[PDB]
Design a protein around this ligand. Structure first.
Ligand code: SFG
Ligand code: CL
Ligand code: CL
Length: 271
């Protein structure tokens, strides 16, 4: 099964406007949480701008599709900025999508703090377009060691199948962020680790389906999509994105094709 991956440098709304209704299965969304100076010509707050791509994201998702939105809960009230709560509140008022889960990404290390509890978490809001969203839990279950699995297998009160399939990873993920000495590092300041994206891709999309990322950043989504047998469309407004994408590809070096240019999005939409 050969997959196709398209990438390009452009604004998220320009990408979305080029995608047809219900054509995407999963969207990875790790958006900037502040608007640009020029954005003050048409908006009075962050959501004023964000609601545009949020509405479009929903439009391009298929009936069984989902969108995972990364964000924090530390917004301080600055004009033009916001956080995951700004988005969730907007979604509750204006979207029919369902909040299937609020995932806590609990990372091991971080900065210290003397006047408050040191921050060790970031959130992921998983929104499903409808109640018929796709979910592959078995694909992300965590297996028990042979010792524990044996102990449970003897407990007649427990379902043997559930035991062998492994445990639900829960909505709290203890995963490390990338460090400056990380191998998959490409130079992007807010680069996300492949491990977190793999879990979302494996559980929220089916093989051969399209994964879209319009705030692609380091291009980690394409690398994960290729490795996992999915098709992908990754775009970012920064020209340096093309540099990161090509860097992600070297980490791979399986049948897949890479295509540059928004005019070629269709190559990755074909099922
Ligand atoms: N209008 C836009 N269209 C497409 N990409 C954008 C736009 N504005 C910003 N970006 C890109 O989106 C990414 C935002 C990330 N830094 C977001 C990480 C994280 N949510 C944070 O803000 O800390 C970057 O790679 C930006 O180049
Ligand atoms: Cl939840
Ligand atoms: Cl990234």
């Amino acid at each position: 099964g050969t997959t196709r991956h398209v990438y390009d440098v452009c604004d998220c709304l320009d990408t979305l406007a080029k995608l047809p209704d219900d054509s995407v299965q999963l969207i990875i969304c790790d958006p900037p949480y502040n608007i640009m100076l020029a954005d003050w010509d048409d908006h009075m707050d962050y959501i004023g701008w964000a609601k545009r791509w949020l509405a479009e994201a929903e439009r391009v998702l298929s009936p069984t599709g989902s969108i995972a939105i990364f964000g924090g809960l530390q917004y301080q009230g600055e004009a033009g900025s916001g956080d995951l709560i700004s988005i969730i509140s907007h979604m509750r008022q204006n979207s029919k999508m369902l909040l299937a889960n609020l995932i806590i990404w609990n990372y091991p290390n971080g900065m210290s703090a003397q006047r408050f509890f040191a921050n060790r978490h970031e959130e992921i809001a998983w929104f499903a377009k409808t109640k018929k969203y796709f979910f592959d839990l078995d694909a992300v279950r965590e297996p028990y060691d042979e010792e524990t699995k044996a102990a449970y297998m003897k407990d007649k009160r427990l379902n043997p199948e559930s035991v062998e399939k492994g445990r639900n990873p829960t909505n709290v993920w203890r995963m490390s962020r990338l460090n400056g000495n990380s191998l998959e590092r490409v130079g992007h300041p807010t680069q996300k680790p492949a491990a977190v994206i793999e879990r979302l891709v494996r559980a929220l999309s089916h093989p051969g389906s399209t994964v879209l990322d319009f705030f692609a950043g380091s291009g980690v989504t394409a690398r994960v999509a290729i490795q996992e047998g999915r098709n992908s469309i990754c775009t970012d407004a920064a020209p340096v994105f093309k540099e990161y994408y090509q860097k992600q590809l070297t980490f791979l070096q399986r049948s897949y094709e890479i295509v540059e240019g928004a005019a070629n999005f269709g190559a990755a939409l074909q099922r």
